[PDB]
Structure 1
Amino acid sequence: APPSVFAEVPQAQPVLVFKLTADFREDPDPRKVNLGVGAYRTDDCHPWVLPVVKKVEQKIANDNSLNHEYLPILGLAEFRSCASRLALGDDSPALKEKRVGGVQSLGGTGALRIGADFLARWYNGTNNKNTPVYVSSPTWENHNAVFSAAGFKDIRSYRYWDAEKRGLDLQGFLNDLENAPEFSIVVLHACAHNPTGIDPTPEQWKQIASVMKHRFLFPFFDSAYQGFASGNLERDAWAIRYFVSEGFEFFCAQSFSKNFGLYNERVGNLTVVGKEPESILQVLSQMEKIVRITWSNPPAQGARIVASTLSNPELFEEWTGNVKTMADRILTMRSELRARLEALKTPGTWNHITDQIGMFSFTGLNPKQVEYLVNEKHIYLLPSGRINVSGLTTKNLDYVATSIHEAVTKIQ
Structure 2
Amino acid sequence: PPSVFAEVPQAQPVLVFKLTADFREDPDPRKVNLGVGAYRTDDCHPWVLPVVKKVEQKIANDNSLNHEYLPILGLAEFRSCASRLALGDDSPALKEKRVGGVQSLGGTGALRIGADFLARWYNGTNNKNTPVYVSSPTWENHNAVFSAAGFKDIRSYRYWDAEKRGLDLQGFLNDLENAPEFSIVVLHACAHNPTGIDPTPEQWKQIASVMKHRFLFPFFDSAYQGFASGNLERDAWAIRYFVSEGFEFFCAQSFSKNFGLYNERVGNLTVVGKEPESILQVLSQMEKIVRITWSNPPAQGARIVASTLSNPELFEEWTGNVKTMADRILTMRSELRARLEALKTPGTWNHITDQIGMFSFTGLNPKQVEYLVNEKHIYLLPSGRINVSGLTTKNLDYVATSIHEAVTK
Q: TM-score, normalised by structure 1?
A: 0.99
Aligned residue number for residue 284 of structure 1:
283
Q: Tell me the distance in 2 between the aligned counterparts of 1:244 and 1:182.
A: 20
Whether contact under 8 Å (2:104, 2:268) holds in the other structure is yes
3-state SS of 2:90 partner = coil
Q: Tell me the distance in 2 between the aligned counterparts of 1:214 and 1:367.
A: 38
Whether contact under 8 Å (2:179, 2:214) holds in the other structure is no
Whether contact under 8 Å (1:165, 1:349) holds in the other structure is no
Whether contact under 8 Å (2:49, 2:260) holds in the other structure is yes
List alignment gaps of at least 5 residues for structure 1.
none
Aligned residue number for residue 161 of structure 1:
160
Q: Tell me the distance in 2 between the aligned counterparts of 1:324 and 1:219.
A: 28
Stretches of 4+ aligned residues off by more than 2 angstroms: none
Cα deviation, residue 66, structure 1: 0.3
- RMSD value, Cα: 0.5
Structure 1, residues 344-393: CA drift from partner, whole Å, max 9, x if none?
00000000000000000000011100000001100000000000000000
Q: Tell me the distance in 2 between the aligned counterparts of 1:54 and 1:102.
A: 26
Q: Tell me the distance in 2 between the aligned counterparts of 1:310 and 1:370.
A: 41
Structure 1, residues 6-56: CA drift from partner, whole Å, max 9, x if none?
111101011111000001001110000000000000000000000000000
Q: Tell me the distance in 2 between the aligned counterparts of 1:136 and 1:242.
A: 20
Aligned residue number for residue 200 of structure 1:
199
Cα deviation, residue 169, structure 1: 0.3
Whether contact under 8 Å (2:190, 2:198) holds in the other structure is yes
3-state SS of 1:182 partner = coil
Q: Tell me the distance in 1 between the aligned counterparts of 2:277 and 2:13.
A: 46
Q: Tell me the distance in 1 between the aligned counterparts of 2:215 and 2:100.
A: 23
Cα deviation, residue 69, structure 1: 0.1
Whether contact under 8 Å (2:180, 2:214) holds in the other structure is no
Whether contact under 8 Å (1:363, 1:387) holds in the other structure is yes
Structure 1, residues 280-326: CA drift from partner, whole Å, max 9, x if none?
00000110000000001000000000000000000000000000000
Aligned residue number for residue 214 of structure 2:
215
Aligned residue number for residue 50 of structure 2:
51
Cα deviation, residue 209, structure 1: 0.4
Whether contact under 8 Å (2:131, 2:151) holds in the other structure is yes
Whether contact under 8 Å (1:166, 1:364) holds in the other structure is yes
Cα deviation, residue 278, structure 1: 1.6
Cα deviation, residue 94, structure 1: 1.6
Equivalence map 1:239-250=2 (5 Å)? 239-250=238-249
Q: Tell me the distance in 2 between the aligned counterparts of 1:219 and 1:45.
A: 37
Q: Tell me the distance in 2 between the aligned counterparts of 1:14 and 1:103.
A: 31
Cα deviation, residue 341, structure 1: 0.4
Cα deviation, residue 171, structure 1: 1.2
Whether contact under 8 Å (1:197, 1:358) holds in the other structure is yes
Cα deviation, residue 183, structure 1: 1.2
Q: Tell me the distance in 1 between the aligned counterparts of 2:285 and 2:120.
A: 11
Q: Tell me the distance in 2 between the aligned counterparts of 1:346 and 1:275.
A: 52
Aligned residue number for residue 21 of structure 2:
22
Q: Which moved more, 1:295-304 or 1:151-160?
A: 151-160
Structure 1, residues 225-265: CA drift from partner, whole Å, max 9, x if none?
00000001010000000100111110000000000000000
Q: Tell me the distance in 2 between the aligned counterparts of 1:108 and 1:242.
A: 21
Percent of counterpart pairs with the same letter? Answer: 100
Q: Tell me the distance in 1 between the aligned counterparts of 2:248 and 2:74.
A: 22
Note if 1:330 corresponds to 2:329: yes
Q: Tell me the distance in 1 between the aligned counterparts of 2:128 and 2:195.
A: 30
